[PDB]
Amino acid sequence: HMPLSNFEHKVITECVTIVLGDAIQVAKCYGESVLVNAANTHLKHGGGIAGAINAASKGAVQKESDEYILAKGPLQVGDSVLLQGHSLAKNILHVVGPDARAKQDVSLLSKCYKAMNAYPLVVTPLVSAGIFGVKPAVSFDYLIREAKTRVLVVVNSQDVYKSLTI
Ligand SMILES: Nc1ncnc2c1ncn2[C@@H]1O[C@H](COP(=O)(O)OP(=O)(O)OP(=O)(O)O)[C@@H](O)[C@H]1O
Numbered sequence: 001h002m003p004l005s006n007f008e009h010k011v012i013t014e015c016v017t018i019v020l021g022d023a024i025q026v027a028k029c030y031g032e033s034v035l036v037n038a039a040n041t042h043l044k045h046g047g048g049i050a051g052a053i054n055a056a057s058k059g060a061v062q063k064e065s066d067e068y069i070l071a072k073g074p075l076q077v078g079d080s081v082l083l084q085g086h087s088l089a090k091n092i093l094h095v096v097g098p099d100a101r102a103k104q105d106v107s108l109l110s111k112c113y114k115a116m117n118a119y120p121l122v123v124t125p126l127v128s129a130g131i132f133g134v135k136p137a138v139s140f141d142y143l144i145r146e147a148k149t150r151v152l153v154v155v156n157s158q159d160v161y162k163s164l165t166i
Pocket residue numbers: 021022023024038039047048049050052125126127128129130131132136154155156157
């Protein structure tokens with residue numbers, strides 16, 4: 001079974017496909033992929049996809065992240081950091097999308113998605129599209145504008161999936 005058949009998906013461009021499912025699982029089918037974590041300034045992976053990723057890695061993502069943040073200090077918004085994959089992916093790219101509730105610049109999503117272009121295959125959720133208050137459609141708009149590499153954008157609500165795929 002070629003990986004994406006385990007999932008409902010729709011190719012948008014030769015670059016971007018929209019997959020309905022859990023991004024952790026999609027990334028598990030591609031060992032050469034980089035998994036995008038939708039993270040905060042302090043890489044505190046307490047919930048959302050950050051907590052699911054931290055939990056899949058059995059706490060390891062949190063401890064690596066604590067060492068990095070202690071050493072470098074906290075990340076700005078739109079910053080990204082490539083860290084270990086903890087066998088969930090070749091690597092995890094921790095991406096700090098803007099927080100709309102806090103009235104942060106949503107065009108910083110462009111900076112977040114740009115970072116994904118350094119990798120040949122990336123599996124990502126919609127950055128800032130949950131508690132951070134950016135509509136998934138709006139997050140998807142920033143992604144499709146910047147994606148120059150092969151990006152599997154994975155949405156785990158079926159409603160979001162139907163909206164994105166017309
Ligand atoms: N394992 C996951 N895989 C793919 N998409 C996810 C996953 N978990 C959450 N999402 C979706 O991707 C987007 C980014 O998630 P985010 O890191 O901002 O945490 P969250 O959205 O507040 O968590 P939740 O949606 O469960 O309340 C959200 O719209 C969210 O619903």
